[PDB]
């Protein structure tokens, strides 16, 4: 069980997230990853991305009344990964059939007419390899675009175009 | 008076829907109505709008594997309401919490920077008044925009903006 | 903050409850409700049920040494709700994870082989709407079986099966 | 279904009620509430009280030829409310003047020399509060006694006396 400190993941406390009230768990190893975009604005710096993650959480917790931000992880264009509900807590990002069997990661921004920068993508891929290293994800895990399991424009055309070219993508 | 007196809808056969396989049912009268937009292209004729309703339905059934198009009713810019799951079948448009206690109506098109023409709006409000008359909806029913209960841009800024003005809208 | 009082709860002074030595409070609005059964004797008259409440309180206090009867509320088969620690005080019924973020209501009886009467079910369902109306429970509160947050049979197979039908239920 | 009667009312069916033949609706918002005692036998358990509601209905239907039991609601010493004609139907409880303008709630038993239980008092308020919530009782509703409007002794001296101590009551 060789140890990799692959957590180039910014903790909840570090981006000053509100405390979570979610308690239901994901049984590891999880088989799926559903990729979405927030459809909101992007951020290209730890400082702005921290705030942007606060806003997304805000919307979900204050406006929608949820126990925590809906994603397990969020990707910023600053090239960092933000801890959402994490590897062990069931997200609220792709429905009742998919949330309990998937890890939901969301790129912060709107990708209908923009590609996320290479470092945002490297962070996403690095985050999945990590999940595999830890046994949080099956080594043969499958990636889905949010539009493949729920009716939505998410994760955006350009971004959707890209994940389809991904090794673990299966529609 | 009686027996009926309510707004008109294009029936499933008329638009050429595949047969529904959905079985789960809503309890009447329903307290909530959720307004979304399909987020795709719009249609301003009975011909293109039926075609449109086909597509949306194809995506939900052929691609997401659902028993039927997600919405209870669709609204075209042609001025006609399109039968979806109807007043009795639980739809799949606003998630596990609202699907079983609401009627999901979705305008066909994207209303982020565009508003639906007056006739599409009359159709939608006609429909709600129809639903009330049928006892399918409570007389003190409430309207929510899709974004008020799910993380999404739906029903679109301009549309969402419009429904905030409605007699039955409740944030 | 929300003027009108609610439901028909038999207050403490009426079922002759020992004073409470509990002080740790709950952050309102509470998100979860965990349904349990006492697994003790059932009662179907105000007098026998007032007694049973007393029995349950006393056993938690005198024998287990708890600051007050562990449940936030108790339900009789006489169809009445019995005030336990109430809405503002943290209770001891579902473990350290859940006790600070939930409301615990217990049906006085054993429900492995008996279903409680409709009036008991009704009293519970109505106690919850009160909780919301009062602002003690979130409008989108979630009900969980005792067994879905702990290893146990509680609230009993029959009662468990029932609450799985309630609209605010989440496994 | 999913919405049960507010304030834990025992449904017509639970107390084994004969079907109603009444058609005369009252148009809520009703302005008044009249309190009578049935002058019949009292009961303090859910079992005995269901028989009494059945007793009183039978008397009114089989013997007086009425379309249903006189009252809109009956209160029990068990602390439960019993559905009579409900909110919508005009009841026969206080003559040709007040039957069309008020809601008749009747305490089961003779209360000339008996003061009824506080739980039954709580259930009564509970009934009136949930009446407003429904749109049946005008939010600013008013209360009168049976003897305040007819040559009768009902609701009984002890019972009548406390009804005056009320808030919503109008002299």
UniProtKB/Swiss-Prot annotation, chains A, B, C, D:
Keywords: Antibiotic, Antimicrobial, Disulfide bond, Immunity, Innate immunity, Secreted, Signal. It holds the Pfam family Amidase_2. Disulfide bonds join 6-130, 22-67, 43-49. Residues 28-156 form the N-acetylmuramoyl-L-alanine amidase domain. GO terms for cellular component: extracellular region. CDD domains: PGRP. GO terms for biological process: defense response to Gram-positive bacterium; detection of bacterium; innate immune response; negative regulation of cytokine production; peptidoglycan catabolic process. Its main location: secreted. The keyword Signal applies. It is found in: Secreted; Cytoplasmic granule. Belongs to the N-acetylmuramoyl-L-alanine amidase 2 family. Homotetramer. PANTHER family: PEPTIDOGLYCAN RECOGNITION PROTEIN (PTHR11022), PEPTIDOGLYCAN RECOGNITION PROTEIN 1 (PTHR11022:SF58). Innate immunity protein that plays several important functions in antimicrobial and antitumor defense systems. Acts as a pattern receptor that binds to murein peptidoglycans (PGN) of Gram-positive bacteria and thus provides bactericidal activity. Forms an equimolar complex with heat shock protein HSPA1A and induces programmed cell death through apoptosis and necroptosis in tumor cell lines by activating the TNFR1 receptor on the target cell membrane. In addition, acts in complex with the Ca(2+)-binding protein S100A4 as a chemoattractant able to induce lymphocyte movement. This is Peptidoglycan recognition protein 1. The gene is PGLYRP1.
